[PDB]
JSON list of C-alpha atoms in Angstrom, two decimals:
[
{"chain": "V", "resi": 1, "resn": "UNK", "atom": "CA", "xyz": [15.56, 16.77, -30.05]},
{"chain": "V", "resi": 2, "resn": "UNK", "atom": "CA", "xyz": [11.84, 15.73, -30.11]},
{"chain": "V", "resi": 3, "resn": "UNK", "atom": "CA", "xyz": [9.06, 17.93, -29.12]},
{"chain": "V", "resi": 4, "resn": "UNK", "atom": "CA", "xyz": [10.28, 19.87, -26.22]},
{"chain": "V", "resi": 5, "resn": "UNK", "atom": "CA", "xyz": [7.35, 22.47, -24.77]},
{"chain": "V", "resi": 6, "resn": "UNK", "atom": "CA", "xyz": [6.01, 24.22, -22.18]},
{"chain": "V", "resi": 7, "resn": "UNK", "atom": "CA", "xyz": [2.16, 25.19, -20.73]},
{"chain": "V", "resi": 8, "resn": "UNK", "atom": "CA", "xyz": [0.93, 28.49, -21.36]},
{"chain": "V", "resi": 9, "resn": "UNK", "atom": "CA", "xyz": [-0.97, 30.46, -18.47]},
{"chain": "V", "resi": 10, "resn": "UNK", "atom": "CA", "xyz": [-1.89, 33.92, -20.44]},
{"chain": "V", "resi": 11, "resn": "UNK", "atom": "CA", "xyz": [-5.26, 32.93, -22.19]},
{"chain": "V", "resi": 12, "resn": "UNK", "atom": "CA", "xyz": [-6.94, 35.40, -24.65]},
{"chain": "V", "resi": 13, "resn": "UNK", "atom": "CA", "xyz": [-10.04, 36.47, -22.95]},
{"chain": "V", "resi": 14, "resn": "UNK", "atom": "CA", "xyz": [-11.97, 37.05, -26.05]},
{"chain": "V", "resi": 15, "resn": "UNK", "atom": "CA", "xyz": [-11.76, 35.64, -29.65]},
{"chain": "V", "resi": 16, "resn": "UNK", "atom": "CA", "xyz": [-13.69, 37.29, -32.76]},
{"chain": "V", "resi": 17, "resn": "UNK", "atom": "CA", "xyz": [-14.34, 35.62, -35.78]},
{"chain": "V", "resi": 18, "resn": "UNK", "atom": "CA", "xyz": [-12.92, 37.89, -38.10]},
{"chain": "V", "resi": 19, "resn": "UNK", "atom": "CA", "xyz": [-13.21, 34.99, -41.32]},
{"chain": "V", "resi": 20, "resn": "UNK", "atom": "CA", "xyz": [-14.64, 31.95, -41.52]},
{"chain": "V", "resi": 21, "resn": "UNK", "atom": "CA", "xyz": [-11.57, 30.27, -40.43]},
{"chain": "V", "resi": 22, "resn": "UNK", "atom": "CA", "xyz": [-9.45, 33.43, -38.87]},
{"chain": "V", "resi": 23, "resn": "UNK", "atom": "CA", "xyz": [-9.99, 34.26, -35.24]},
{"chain": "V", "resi": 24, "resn": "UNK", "atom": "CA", "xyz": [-8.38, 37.54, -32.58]},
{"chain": "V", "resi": 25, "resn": "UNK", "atom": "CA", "xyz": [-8.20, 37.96, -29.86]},
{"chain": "V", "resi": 26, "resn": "UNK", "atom": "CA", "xyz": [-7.77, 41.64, -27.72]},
{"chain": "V", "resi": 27, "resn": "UNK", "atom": "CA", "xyz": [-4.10, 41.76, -28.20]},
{"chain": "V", "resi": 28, "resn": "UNK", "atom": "CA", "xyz": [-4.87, 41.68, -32.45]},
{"chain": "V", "resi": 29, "resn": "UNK", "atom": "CA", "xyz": [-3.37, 37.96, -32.33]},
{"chain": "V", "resi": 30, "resn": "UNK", "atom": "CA", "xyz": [-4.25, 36.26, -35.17]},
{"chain": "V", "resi": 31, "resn": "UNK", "atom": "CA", "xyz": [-5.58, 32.37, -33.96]},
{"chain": "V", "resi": 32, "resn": "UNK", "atom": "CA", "xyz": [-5.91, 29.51, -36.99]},
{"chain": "V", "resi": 33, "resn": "UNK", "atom": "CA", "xyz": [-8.38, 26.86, -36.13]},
{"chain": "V", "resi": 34, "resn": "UNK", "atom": "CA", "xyz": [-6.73, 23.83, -37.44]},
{"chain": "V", "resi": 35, "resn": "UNK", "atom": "CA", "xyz": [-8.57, 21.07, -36.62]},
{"chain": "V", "resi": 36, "resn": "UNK", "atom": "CA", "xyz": [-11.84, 20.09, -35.11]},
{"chain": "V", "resi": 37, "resn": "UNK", "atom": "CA", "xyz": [-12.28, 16.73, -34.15]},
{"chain": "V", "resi": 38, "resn": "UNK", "atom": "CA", "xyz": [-16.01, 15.07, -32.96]},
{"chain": "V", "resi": 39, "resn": "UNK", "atom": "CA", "xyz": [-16.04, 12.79, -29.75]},
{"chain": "V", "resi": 40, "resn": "UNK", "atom": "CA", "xyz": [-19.13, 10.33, -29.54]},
{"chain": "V", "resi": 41, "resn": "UNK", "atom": "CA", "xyz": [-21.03, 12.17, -32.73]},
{"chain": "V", "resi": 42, "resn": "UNK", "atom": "CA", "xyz": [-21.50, 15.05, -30.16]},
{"chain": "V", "resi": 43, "resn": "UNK", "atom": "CA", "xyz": [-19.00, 16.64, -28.47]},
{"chain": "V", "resi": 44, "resn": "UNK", "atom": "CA", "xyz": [-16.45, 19.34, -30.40]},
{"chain": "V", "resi": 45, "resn": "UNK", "atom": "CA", "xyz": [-12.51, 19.67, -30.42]},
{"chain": "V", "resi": 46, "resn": "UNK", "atom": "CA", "xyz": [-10.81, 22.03, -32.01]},
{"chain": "V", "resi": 47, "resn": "UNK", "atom": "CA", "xyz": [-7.43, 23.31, -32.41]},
{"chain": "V", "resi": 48, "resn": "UNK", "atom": "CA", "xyz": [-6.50, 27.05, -32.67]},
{"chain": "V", "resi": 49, "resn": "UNK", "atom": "CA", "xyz": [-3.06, 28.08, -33.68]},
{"chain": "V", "resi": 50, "resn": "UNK", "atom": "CA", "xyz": [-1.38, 31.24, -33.40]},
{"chain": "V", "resi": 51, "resn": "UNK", "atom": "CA", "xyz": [-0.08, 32.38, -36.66]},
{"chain": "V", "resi": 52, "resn": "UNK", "atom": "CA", "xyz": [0.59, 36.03, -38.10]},
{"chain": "V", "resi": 53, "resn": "UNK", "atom": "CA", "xyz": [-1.62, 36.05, -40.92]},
{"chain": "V", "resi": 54, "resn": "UNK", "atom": "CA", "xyz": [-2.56, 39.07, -43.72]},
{"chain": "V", "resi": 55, "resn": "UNK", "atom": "CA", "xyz": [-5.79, 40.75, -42.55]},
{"chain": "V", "resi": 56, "resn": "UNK", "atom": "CA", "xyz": [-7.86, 43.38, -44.16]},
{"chain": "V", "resi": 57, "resn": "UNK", "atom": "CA", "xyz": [-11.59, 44.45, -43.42]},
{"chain": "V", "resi": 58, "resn": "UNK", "atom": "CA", "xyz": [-12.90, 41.91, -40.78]},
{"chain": "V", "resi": 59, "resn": "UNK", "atom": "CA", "xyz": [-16.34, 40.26, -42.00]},
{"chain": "V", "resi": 60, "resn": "UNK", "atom": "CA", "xyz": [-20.40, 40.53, -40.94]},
{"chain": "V", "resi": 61, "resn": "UNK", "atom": "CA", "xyz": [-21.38, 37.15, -39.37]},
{"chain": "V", "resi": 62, "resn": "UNK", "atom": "CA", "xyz": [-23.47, 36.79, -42.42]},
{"chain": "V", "resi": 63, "resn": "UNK", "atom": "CA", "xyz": [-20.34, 36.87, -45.03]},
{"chain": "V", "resi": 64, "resn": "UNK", "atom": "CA", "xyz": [-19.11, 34.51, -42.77]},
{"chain": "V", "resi": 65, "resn": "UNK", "atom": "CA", "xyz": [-22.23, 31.88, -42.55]},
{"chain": "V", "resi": 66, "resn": "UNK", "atom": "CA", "xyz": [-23.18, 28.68, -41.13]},
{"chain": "V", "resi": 67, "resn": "UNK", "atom": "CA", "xyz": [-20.42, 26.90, -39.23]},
{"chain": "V", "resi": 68, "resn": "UNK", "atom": "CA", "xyz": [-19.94, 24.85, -35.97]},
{"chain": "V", "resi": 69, "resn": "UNK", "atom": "CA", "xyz": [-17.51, 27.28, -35.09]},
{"chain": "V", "resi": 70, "resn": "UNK", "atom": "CA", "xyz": [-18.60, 30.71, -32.76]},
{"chain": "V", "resi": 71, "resn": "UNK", "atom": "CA", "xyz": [-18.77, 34.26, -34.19]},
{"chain": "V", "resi": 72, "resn": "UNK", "atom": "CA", "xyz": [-17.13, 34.88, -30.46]},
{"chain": "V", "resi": 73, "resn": "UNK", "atom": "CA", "xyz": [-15.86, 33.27, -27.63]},
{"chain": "V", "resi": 74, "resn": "UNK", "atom": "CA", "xyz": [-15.77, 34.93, -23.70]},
{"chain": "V", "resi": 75, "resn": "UNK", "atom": "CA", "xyz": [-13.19, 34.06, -21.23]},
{"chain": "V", "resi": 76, "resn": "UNK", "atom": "CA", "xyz": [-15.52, 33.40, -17.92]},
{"chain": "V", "resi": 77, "resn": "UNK", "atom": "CA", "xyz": [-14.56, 34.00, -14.20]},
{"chain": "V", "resi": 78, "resn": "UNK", "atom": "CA", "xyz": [-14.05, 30.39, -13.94]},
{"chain": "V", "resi": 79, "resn": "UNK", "atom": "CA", "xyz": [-12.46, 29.91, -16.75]},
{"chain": "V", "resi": 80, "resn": "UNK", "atom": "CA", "xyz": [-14.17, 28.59, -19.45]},
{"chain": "V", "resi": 81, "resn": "UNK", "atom": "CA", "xyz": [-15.10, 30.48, -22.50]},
{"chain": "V", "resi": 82, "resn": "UNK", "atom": "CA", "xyz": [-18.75, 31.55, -23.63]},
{"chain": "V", "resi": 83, "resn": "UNK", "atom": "CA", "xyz": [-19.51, 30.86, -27.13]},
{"chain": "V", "resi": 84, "resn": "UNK", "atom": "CA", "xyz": [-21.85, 33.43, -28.40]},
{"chain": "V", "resi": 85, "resn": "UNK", "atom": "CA", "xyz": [-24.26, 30.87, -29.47]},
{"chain": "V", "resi": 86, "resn": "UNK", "atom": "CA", "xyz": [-24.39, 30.07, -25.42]},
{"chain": "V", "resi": 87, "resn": "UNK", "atom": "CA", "xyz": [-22.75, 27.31, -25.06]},
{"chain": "V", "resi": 88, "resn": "UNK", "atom": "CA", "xyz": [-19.94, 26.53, -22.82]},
{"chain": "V", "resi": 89, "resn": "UNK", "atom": "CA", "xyz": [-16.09, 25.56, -23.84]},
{"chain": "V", "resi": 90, "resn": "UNK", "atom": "CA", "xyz": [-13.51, 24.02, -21.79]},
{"chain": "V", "resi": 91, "resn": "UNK", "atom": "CA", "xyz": [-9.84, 24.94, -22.28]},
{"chain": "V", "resi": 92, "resn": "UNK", "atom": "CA", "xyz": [-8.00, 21.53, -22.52]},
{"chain": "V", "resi": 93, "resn": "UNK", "atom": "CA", "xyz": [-4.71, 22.83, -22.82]},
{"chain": "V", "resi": 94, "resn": "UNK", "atom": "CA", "xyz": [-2.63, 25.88, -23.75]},
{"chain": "V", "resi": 95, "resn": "UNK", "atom": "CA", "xyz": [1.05, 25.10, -24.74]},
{"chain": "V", "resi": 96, "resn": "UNK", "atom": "CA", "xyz": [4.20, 26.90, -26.81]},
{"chain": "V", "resi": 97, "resn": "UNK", "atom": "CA", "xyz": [6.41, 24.20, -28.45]},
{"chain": "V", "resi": 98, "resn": "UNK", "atom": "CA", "xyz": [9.41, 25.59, -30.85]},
{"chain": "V", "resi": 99, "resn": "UNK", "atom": "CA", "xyz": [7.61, 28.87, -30.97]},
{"chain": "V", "resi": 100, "resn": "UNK", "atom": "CA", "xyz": [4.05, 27.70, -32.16]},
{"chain": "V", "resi": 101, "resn": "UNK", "atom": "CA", "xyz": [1.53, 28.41, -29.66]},
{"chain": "V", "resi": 102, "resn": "UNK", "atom": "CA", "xyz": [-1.69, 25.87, -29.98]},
{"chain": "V", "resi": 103, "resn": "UNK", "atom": "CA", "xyz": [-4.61, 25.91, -27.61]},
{"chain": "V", "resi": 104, "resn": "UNK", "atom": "CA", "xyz": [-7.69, 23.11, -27.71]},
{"chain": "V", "resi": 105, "resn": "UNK", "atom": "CA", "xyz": [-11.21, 24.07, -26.78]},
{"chain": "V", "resi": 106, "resn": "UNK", "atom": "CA", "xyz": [-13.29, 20.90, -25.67]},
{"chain": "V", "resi": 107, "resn": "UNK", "atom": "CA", "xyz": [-17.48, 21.65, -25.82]},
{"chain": "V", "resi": 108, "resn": "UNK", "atom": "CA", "xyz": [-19.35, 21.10, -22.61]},
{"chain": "V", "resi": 109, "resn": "UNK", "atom": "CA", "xyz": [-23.08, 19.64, -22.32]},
{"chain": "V", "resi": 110, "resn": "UNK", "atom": "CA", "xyz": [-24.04, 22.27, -19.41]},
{"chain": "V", "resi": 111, "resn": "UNK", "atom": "CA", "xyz": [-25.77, 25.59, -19.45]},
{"chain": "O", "resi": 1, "resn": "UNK", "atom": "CA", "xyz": [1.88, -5.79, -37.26]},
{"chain": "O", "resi": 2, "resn": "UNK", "atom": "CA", "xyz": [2.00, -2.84, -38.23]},
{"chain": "O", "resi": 3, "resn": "UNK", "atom": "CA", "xyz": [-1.04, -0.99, -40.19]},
{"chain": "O", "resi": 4, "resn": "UNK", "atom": "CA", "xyz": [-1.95, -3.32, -43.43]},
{"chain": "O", "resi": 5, "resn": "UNK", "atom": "CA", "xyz": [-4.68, -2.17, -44.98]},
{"chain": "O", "resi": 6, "resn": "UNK", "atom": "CA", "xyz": [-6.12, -1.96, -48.48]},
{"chain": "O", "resi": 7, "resn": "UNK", "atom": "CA", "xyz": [-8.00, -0.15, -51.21]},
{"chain": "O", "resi": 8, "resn": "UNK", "atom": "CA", "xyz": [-11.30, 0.13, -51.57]},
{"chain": "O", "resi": 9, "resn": "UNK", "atom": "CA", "xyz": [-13.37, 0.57, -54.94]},
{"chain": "O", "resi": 10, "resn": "UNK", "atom": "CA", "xyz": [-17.09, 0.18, -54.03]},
{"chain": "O", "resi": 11, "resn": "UNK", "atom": "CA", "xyz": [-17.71, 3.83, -52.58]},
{"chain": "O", "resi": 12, "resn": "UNK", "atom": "CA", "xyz": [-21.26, 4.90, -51.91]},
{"chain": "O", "resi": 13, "resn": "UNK", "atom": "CA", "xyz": [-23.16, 6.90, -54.43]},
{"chain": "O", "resi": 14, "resn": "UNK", "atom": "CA", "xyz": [-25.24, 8.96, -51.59]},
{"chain": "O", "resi": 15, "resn": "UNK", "atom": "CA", "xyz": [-24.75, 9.81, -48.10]},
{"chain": "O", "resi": 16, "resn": "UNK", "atom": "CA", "xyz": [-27.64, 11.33, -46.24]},
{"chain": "O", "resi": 17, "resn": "UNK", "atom": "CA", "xyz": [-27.31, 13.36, -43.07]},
{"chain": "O", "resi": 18, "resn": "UNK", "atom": "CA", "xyz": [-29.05, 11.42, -40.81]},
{"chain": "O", "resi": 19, "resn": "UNK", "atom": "CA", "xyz": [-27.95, 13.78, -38.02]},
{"chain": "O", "resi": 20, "resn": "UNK", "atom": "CA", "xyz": [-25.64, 16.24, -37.12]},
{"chain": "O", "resi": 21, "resn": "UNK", "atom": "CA", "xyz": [-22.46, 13.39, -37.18]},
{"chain": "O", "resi": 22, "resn": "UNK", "atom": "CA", "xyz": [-24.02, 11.07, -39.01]},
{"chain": "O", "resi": 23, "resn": "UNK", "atom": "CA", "xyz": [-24.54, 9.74, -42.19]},
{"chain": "O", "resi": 24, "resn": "UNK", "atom": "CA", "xyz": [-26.52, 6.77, -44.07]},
{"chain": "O", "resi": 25, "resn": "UNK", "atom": "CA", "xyz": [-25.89, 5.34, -47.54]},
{"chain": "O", "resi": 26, "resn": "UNK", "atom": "CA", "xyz": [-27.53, 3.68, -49.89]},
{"chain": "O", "resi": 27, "resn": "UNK", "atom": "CA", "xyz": [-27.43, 0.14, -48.13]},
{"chain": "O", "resi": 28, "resn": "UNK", "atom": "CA", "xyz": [-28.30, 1.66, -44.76]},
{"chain": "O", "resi": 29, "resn": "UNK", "atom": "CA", "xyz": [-24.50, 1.83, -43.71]},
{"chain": "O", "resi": 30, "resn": "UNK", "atom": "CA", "xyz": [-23.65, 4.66, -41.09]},
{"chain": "O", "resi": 31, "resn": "UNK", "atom": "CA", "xyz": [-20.64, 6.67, -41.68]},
{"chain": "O", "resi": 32, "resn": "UNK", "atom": "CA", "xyz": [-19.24, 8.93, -38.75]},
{"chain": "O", "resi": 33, "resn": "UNK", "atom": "CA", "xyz": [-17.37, 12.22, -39.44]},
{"chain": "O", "resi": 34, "resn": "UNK", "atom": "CA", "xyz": [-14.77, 12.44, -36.69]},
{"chain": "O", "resi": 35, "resn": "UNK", "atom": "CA", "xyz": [-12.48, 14.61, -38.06]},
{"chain": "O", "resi": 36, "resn": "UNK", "atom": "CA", "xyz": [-12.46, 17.84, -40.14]},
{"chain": "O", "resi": 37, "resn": "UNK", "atom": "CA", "xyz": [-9.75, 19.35, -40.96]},
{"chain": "O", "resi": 38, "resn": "UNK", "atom": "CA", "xyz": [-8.74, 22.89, -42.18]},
{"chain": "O", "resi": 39, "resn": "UNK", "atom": "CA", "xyz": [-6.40, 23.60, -44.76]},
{"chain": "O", "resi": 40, "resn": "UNK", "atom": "CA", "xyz": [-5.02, 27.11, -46.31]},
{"chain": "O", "resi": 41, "resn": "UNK", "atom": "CA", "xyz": [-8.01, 28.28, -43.71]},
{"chain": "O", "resi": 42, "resn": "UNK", "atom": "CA", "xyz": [-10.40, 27.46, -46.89]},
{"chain": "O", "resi": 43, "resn": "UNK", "atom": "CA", "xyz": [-10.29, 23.71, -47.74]},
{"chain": "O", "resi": 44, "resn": "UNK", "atom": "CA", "xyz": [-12.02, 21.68, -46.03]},
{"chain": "O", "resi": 45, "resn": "UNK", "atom": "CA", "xyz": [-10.74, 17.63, -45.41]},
{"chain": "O", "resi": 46, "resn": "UNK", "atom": "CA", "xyz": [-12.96, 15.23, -43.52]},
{"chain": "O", "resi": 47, "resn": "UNK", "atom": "CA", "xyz": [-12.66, 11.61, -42.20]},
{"chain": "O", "resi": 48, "resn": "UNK", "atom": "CA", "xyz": [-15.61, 9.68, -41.87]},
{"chain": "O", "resi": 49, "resn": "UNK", "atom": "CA", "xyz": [-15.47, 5.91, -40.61]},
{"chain": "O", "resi": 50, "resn": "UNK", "atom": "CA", "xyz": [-18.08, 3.06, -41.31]},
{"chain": "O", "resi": 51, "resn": "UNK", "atom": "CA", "xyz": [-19.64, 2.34, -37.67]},
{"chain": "O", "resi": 52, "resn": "UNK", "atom": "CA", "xyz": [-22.62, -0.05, -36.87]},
{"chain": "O", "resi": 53, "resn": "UNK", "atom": "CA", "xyz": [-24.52, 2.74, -34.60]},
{"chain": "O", "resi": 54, "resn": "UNK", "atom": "CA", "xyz": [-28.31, 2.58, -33.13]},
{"chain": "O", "resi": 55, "resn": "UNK", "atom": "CA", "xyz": [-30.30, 5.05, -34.84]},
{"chain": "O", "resi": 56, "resn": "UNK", "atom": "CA", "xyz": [-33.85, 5.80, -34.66]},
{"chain": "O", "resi": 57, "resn": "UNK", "atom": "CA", "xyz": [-35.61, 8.37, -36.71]},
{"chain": "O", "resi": 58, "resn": "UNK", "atom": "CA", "xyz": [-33.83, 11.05, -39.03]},
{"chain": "O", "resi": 59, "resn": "UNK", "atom": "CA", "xyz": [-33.53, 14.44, -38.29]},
{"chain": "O", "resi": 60, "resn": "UNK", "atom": "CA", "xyz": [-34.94, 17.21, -40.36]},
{"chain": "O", "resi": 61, "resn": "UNK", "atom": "CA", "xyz": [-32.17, 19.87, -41.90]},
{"chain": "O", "resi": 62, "resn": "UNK", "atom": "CA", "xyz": [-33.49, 22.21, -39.73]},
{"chain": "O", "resi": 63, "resn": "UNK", "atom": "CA", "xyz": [-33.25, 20.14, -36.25]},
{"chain": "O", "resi": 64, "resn": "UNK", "atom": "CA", "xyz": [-30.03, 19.38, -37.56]},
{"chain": "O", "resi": 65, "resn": "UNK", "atom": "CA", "xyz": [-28.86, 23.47, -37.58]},
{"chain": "O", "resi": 66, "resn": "UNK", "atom": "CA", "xyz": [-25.97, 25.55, -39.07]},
{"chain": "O", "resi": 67, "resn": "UNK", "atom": "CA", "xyz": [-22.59, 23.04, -40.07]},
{"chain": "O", "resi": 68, "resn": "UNK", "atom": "CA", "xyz": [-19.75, 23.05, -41.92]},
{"chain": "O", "resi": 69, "resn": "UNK", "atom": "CA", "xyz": [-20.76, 19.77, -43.30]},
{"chain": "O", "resi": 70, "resn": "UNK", "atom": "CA", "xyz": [-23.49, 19.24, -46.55]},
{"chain": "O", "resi": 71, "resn": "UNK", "atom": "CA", "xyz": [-27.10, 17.51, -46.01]},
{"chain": "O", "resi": 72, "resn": "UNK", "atom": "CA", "xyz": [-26.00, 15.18, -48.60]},
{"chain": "O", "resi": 73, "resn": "UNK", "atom": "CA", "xyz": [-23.39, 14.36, -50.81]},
{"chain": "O", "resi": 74, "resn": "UNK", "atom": "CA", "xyz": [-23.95, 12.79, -54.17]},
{"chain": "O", "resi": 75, "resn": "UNK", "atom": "CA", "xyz": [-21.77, 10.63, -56.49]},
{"chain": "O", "resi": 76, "resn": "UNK", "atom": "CA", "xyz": [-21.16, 11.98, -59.71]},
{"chain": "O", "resi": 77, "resn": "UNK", "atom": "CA", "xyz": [-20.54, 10.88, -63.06]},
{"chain": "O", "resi": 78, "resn": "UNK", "atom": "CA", "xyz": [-16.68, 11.81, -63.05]},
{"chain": "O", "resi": 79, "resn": "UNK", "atom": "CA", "xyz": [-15.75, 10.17, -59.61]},
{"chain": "O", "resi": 80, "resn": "UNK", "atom": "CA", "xyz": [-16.42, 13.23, -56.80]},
{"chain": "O", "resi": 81, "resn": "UNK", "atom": "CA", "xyz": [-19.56, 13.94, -54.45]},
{"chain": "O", "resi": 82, "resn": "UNK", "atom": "CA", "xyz": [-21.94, 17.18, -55.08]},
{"chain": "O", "resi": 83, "resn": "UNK", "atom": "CA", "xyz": [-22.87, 18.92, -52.22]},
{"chain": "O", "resi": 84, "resn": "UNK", "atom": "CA", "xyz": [-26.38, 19.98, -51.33]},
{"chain": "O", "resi": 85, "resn": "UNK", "atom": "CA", "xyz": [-24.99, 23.23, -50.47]},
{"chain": "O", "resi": 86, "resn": "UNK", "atom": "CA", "xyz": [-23.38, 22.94, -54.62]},
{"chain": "O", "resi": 87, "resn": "UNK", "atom": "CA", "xyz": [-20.09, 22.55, -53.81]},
{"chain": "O", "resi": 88, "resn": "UNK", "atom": "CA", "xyz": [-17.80, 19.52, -55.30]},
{"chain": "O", "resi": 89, "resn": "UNK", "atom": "CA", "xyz": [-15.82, 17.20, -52.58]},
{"chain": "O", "resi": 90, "resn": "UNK", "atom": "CA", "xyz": [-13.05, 15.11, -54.48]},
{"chain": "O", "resi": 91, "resn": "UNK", "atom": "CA", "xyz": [-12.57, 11.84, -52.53]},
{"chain": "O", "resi": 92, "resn": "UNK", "atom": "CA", "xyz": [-8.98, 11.24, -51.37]},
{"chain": "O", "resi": 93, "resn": "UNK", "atom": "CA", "xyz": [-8.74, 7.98, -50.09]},
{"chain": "O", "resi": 94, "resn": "UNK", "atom": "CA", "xyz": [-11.49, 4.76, -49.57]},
{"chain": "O", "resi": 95, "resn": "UNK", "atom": "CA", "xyz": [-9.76, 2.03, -47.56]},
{"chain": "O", "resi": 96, "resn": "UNK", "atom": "CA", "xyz": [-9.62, -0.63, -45.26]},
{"chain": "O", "resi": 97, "resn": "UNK", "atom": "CA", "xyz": [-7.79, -1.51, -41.96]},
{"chain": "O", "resi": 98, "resn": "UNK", "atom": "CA", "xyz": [-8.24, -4.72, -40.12]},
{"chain": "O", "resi": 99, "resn": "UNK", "atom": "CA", "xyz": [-11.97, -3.96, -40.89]},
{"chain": "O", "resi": 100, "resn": "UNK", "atom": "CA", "xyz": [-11.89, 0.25, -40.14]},
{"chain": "O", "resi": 101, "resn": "UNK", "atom": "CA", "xyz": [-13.42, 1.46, -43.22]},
{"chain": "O", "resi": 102, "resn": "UNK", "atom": "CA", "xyz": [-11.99, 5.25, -43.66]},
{"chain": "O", "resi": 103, "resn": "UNK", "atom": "CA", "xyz": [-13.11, 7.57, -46.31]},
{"chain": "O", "resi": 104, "resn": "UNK", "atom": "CA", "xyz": [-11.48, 10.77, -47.04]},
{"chain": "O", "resi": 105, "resn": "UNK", "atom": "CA", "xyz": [-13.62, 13.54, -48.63]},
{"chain": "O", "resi": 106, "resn": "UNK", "atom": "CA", "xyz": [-12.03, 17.18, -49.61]},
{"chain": "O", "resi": 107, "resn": "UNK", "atom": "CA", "xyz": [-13.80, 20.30, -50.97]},
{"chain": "O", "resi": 108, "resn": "UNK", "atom": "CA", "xyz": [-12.89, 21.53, -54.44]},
{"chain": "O", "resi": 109, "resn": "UNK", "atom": "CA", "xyz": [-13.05, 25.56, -55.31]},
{"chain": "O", "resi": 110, "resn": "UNK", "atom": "CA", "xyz": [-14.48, 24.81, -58.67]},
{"chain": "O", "resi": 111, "resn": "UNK", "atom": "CA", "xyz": [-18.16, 24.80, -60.02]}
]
């Protein structure tokens, strides 16, 4: 009866910003950034959710403009993802509960 | 026991970016932004909480860098914050529990 879900072990390997607030990844899944949360004025949280949104003509990063959020993120060997602006994301968690699919991305201080 | 908390009517009538998760009022009073919230994957909602931090020298818009979130916010005539970046913010909430000071800012689509 309450939340009843279960870890996830197929990440996306790459997410494109396609809107401001719209991500994809290779397999044309549509990923809602929900939330972002910010730990000790500095480090960044935020909360993608898989949803099947209406898309059209994907946009230039400059229609998109300034954000915290990547143009792109890169699913490394290790297993953190690459934001195109170079820094470095862990993947806190990747679950499925009652269908919806959420993932959290935690910024790292490295190189 | 639970959460009692109460209203608050004295909200400030500027907020400067002091750096990139922090802001200063008019009496000097820091205000953190810890959460930001995405709705309808256009309107933005963000928490910022009263917190006695140290802080040195302010940063310069451009040391600051691309964000999501205004240089400043000003209090207008009819009750909600201008944007430096000319948006309007109307202001949810302003309250008070067992001394947390929360303020709840959303973006408008107006002019």
């Amino acid at each position: 009866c309450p939340t009843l879900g279960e870890a996830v072990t197929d990440h996306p390997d790459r997410l494109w910003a396609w809107e401001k607030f719209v991500y994809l990844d290779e397999k044309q899944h549509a990923w809602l950034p929900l939330t972002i949360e910010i730990k000790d004025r500095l480090q960044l949280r935020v909360l993608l959710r898989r949803e099947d949104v209406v898309l059209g003509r994907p946009m230039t990063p400059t229609q998109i403009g300034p954000s915290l959020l990547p143009i792109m993120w890169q699913l490394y060997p290790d297993g953190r993802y690459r934001s195109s602006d170079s820094s470095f994301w862990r993947l806190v968690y990747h679950i499925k509960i009652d269908g919806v699919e959420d993932m959290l991305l935690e910024l790292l201080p490295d190189d």
